[PDB]
Design a protein around this ligand. Structure first.
Ligand SMILES: NCCCc1ccccc1
Ligand SMILES: NCCCc1ccccc1
Ligand SMILES: NCCCc1ccccc1
Ligand code: NA
Lengths: 346, 332, 324
């Protein structure tokens, strides 16, 4: 097994280590696990795009527990399970209060855990996902909590970037990736998580925002510590801009965030913020020719429909890639055992 | 090697044309396709009634999107998918506003379309289903919208009628089917759709209604155009009545509707009908049909609802099958 | 096919259980209870050894839950899916909004044409019986407001039989002593289990604050059933208002404030005592007990998987049996 046809992947060895691992945080994924996820993820991409058998995990039964509406993420996990050939029982359209009708998180996960092979859990509370992990006799995949932990979003963001700039794996001092994060860097937690993971590689960061909504010093410290550990830190590593014109020069990746209306003092600030950072074909004319545009979605006005037609636009391929990356993670974690002949290979 | 009464079906040829067809409107189904749906539909009826292997479409993953409560139709589509051996992901008990959460229908179907092989979509908005079809990289089956497009209801209504009156396929000047539509002909959109399909054959129509609630001239014109194309139109093709005793004489089919005291079906009302008369109702009923009639052999509305399973299985098989061989098709 | 001592004709018992509807624990006779316990154990051992569990593929069920009972719903879904079958779900609706002015008769006459069987939970007693008379397919009652909950009763019994297998023997010399603690008036899981336990050689301690004691209705049924098997005595049914007396010489404690279970309260019970609770608990059992080896309430919940798989297998199969 090979990735970038350069890095050799012992999926037997890496699956033995990943067996029944719970994935709460992007920090629960090390270098060799990230390689295994990217290789396996690509095999699912190529098998599904060629209309081939995808049933690499058949005999499993999951429970999906979504205690807030996040239909896109929920359907993405259901599709991955179902396309792998396994089965799922769904708990949706409930919250914390209505689902845990008094009963403790501990008791609830101790019970449900005896019914199934694993649990997909989305809950705005960060408390609950950690209680779930300590009470469950089965692996949990965090599909998102209010600490901004969303490992599969982070994983799928990375897979998308690696697809166009495979050198980001190399940790080569001469092959640096430059990325701009645009919009609400304070509340865009998908930025926080992806930044942390990108930070493990040779990466420079443009943080494009309007003071009130800047990246937290929290995440800048983590980025800095991680670049220093790999001797990729310089005074050029992290740059700050309040405008696209400067923000978007010499970056391989533009990652747009949600600018939600509920986040300003009024609709005054909002429309003066939205339309400031709105992405046009005009805004993109002075970017690199190889620039790729990511957005975790849903996009509202952040990106005008005209950009969907620009070849540098890949946000929908990004969403699509979530299927392959969730299939890969499930296969690696829940596969009963490993022989080499069993593994997805196109 | 595939026949419906006496007409030979090239199911291979018809499936090549139907592959990844989106079915929004009854008019998306032509003669050859309607025959394929009726043959396939009958095969599933006979396979399920004899407790036989049903799994003619495994390996497929669907999304069902119901943005209004339509539990019976939803369960019917889920049962068809599951009994064919495929799998489905459900989005229900949400509305337009609460599901799209401000995001565009275009974006939503462009994404969901990448997760699955096909989408079942029910939405009161007619706008949304057509946007979904233009934005989706996969086939859509309309499970109902507020334009009164409901192709599988129309298809299942037709399968039920053909089951008792197979001559409706013959387009024989001497073998005419007479049907009475009773109740709210203005708002009963299942009448509108079925009329349009029946209209392609040798059929006479009794439209039995209130005053405020008669069939719209829109539908009468479509019936007339379609009868004229096959030279089955006469001044006796379309008749109007305000009462059952006249409404229900010499009609092979009675099709009752949701009439939200004068258009109530009794055993008494049915004494003046033909012996071979069959009674349809898309359901749910309230008082339009008295529980008495559920015991009358002419009553087939529950077999009709049952037939929804076989017809939705047939349509999913014909659209989503990833096949090459005649031998692989249901042939029990 | 044996339970060590009793030989089971699973072929013969499945022929009689085929397409049986299960509403009430009284719909299950001796032979059927044996088949459910044998089959239940086979699925326990197959799942604990990570073996193929797909003994009922090719079926499609509908699950209709018209009140929140998420644990019970998920338990049934897991059983169906682990058997290899499929299910279509109707949940997070109630009676009013589900039967949108349409009759239960029409609803079940239609839905029953779409699927091989129906799991139905509804607080109304009326509705489950209408559903059974109007359905062309078998119904499993997952709970109604008459306190009929056969699979809870079945799973309670399997749990007890697991530690005290002699409860099957109807041996005058091998008696099981059980204490039911808490709200015996409203705890309908007590009523149903009492009725089933009553068919065997069992003595009952009813521990409550009087206002909430077991209804005379249930005591009469316990007495009729003990008399039919000549296990009734003046010691068959005792009443207490306190644990220290309540919990002496009882093989089973079944929990449903002086009725709160501590490690302290458990010190003067038998060494073989096992603690059941249908769950969810609040304070009736302190988290400290969850660490006591007598504590088996979570194994009990777990056993609901094996027992619902067994019941679905026995009713909907068309037959090679689960073994080993
Ligand atoms: N909150 C928006 C949900 C719409 C959607 C569902 C599944 C996939 C893509 C979009
Ligand atoms: N709100 C009406 C639901 C009744 C019904 C459910 C499923 C199938 C047939 C009828
Ligand atoms: N009383 C809250 C229900 C929580 C639960 C869900 C599924 C399985 C077990 C418990
Ligand atoms: Na499902």
């Amino acid at each position: 097994f090979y990735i970038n046809s350069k890095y050799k992947i012992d999926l037997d060895k890496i699956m033995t280590k990943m067996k029944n691992k719970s994935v709460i945080n992007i920090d629960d994924v090390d270098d060799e696990e990230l390689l295994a996820i990217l290789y396996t993820s690509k095999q699912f991409e190529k098998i599904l795009k060629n209309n081939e058998d995808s049933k690499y995990l058949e005999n499993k039964v999951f429970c999906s527990v979504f205690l807030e509406p996040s239909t896109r993420t929920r359907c993405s996990f259901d599709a991955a399970i179902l396309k792998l050939g396994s089965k799922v029982l769904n708990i949706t359209d409930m919250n914390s209060t209505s689902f845990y009708k008094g009963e403790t998180v501990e008791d609830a996960f101790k019970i449900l855990s005896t019914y199934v092979d694993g649990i997909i859990y989305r809950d705005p509370s960060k408390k609950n996902v950690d209680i779930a992990v300590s009470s469950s006799s089965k692996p949990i995949i965090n599909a998102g909590n209010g600490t901004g932990e969303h490992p599969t979003q982070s994983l799928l963001d990375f897979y998308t970037i690696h697809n166009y700039f495979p050198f980001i794996l190399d940790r080569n001092i001469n092959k640096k990736l430059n990325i701009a994060f645009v919009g609400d860097l304070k509340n865009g937690r998908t930025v926080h998580s992806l930044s942390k993971l990108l930070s493990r590689y040779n990466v420079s960061f443009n943080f494009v925002s309007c003071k009130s909504l800047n990246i937290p010093k929290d995440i800048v410290n983590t980025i800095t510590y991680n670049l220093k550990k790999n001797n990729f830190y310089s005074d050029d590593s992290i740059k700050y801009f309040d405008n696209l014109e400067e923000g978007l020069e010499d970056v391989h990746i533009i990652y747009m965030t949600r600018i939600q209306k509920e986040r300003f003092t009024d609709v005054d600030e909002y429309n003066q913020y939205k339309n400031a950072f709105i992405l046009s074909n005009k805004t993109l004319e002075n970017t690199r020719d190889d620039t790729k545009i990511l957005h975790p979605l849903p996009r509202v006005n952040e990106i005008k429909v005209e950009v969907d037609s620009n070849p540098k636009s890949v946000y929908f391929t990004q969403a699509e890639n979530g299927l392959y990356v969730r299939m890969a993670l499930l296969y690696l974690i829940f596969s009963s055992t490993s022989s080499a002949w069993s593994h997805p290979q196109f």
